[PDB]
Ligand binder design. Structure first.
Ligand SMILES: NC(=O)c1ccc[n+]([C@@H]2O[C@H](COP(=O)([O-])OP(=O)(O)OC[C@H]3O[C@@H](n4cnc5c(N)ncnc54)[C@H](OP(=O)(O)O)[C@@H]3O)[C@@H](O)[C@H]2O)c1
Length: 204
């Protein structure tokens, strides 16, 4: 099966809980981080740490080296400014995966990619524009791409009881970060989501 995985964005809101969950599942986890201060120093911890930036292809190449699959949870935290970090980072990730024969990438964009584009809140259009750019990168890559498109990410506890809607909008507008990370790892265990959009949501 999949044993060795790389996570990008592992120090983020969803990355931290995905990292913990993956380590407890038994995965051998490699992370690319800009600052190891934002990784936990005890408890569930990754087996390999690369220090660097997803914009530097050499750093991405040594993170993807030797992996079986890739989880992408890159984002901008509280910065809503125009950016190309996620799409450019995604071009780096795709090339390193092809250079190392990795096929499986599970990447998080957002449910707004399933919305009427005129209906996106103006404050979120700039970030959304780069999710679109990133989704196009991965769609065009030809890899085995699970497009995870969550609605609002909350901080409710882990339930593992969430719904997953394929290629459409789901009946709830929230997923907890813990259930979102749980589902990113579920995508590693099956190929039933490959080439589909997935919307995870639950009522808390
Ligand atoms: N919040 C929501 O309601 C919501 C809803 C739908 C979709 N989403 C999308 O879901 C995704 C994840 O959300 P999130 O809140 O879990 O992520 P997040 O809290 O914003 O964490 C972002 C991650 O990306 C990393 N990162 C940013 N730039 C990087 C770079 N140049 N090189 C390496 N790493 C870099 C950050 O590392 P650092 O720690 O060094 O900054 C961090 O680990 C995002 O794309 C977000 O837009 C969010």
């Amino acid at each position: 099966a999949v044993k060795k995985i790389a996570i990008f964005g592992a120090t983020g809101q969803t990355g931290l809980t995905t990292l913990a969950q993956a380590v407890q599942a038994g995965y051998e986890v490699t992370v690319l981080v800009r600052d190891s201060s934002r990784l936990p120093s005890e408890g569930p911890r990754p087996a390999h740490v690369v220090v660097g930036d997803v914009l530097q292809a050499a750093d991405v190449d040594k993170t993807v080296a030797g992996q079986d699959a890739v989880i992408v949870l890159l984002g901008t935290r509280n910065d809503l400014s125009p950016t190309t970090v996620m799409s450019e980072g995604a071009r780096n990730i795709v090339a390193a995966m092809k250079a190392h024969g990795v096929d499986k990438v599970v990447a998080c964009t957002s449910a707004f990619l399933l919305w009427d584009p005129t209906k996106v809140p103006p404050r979120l259009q700039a970030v959304t524009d780069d999710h679109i750019r990133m989704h196009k990168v991965l769609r065009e890559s030809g890899l085995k791409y699970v497009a995870v498109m969550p609605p609002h990410i909350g901080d409710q506890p882990l339930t593992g009881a969430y719904t997953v809607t394929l290629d459409g909008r789901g009946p709830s507008r929230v997923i907890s970060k813990h259930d979102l990370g749980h589902f990113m790892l579920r995508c590693l265990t099956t190929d039933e989501y490959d080439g589909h959009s997935t919307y995870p949501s639950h009522q808390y």
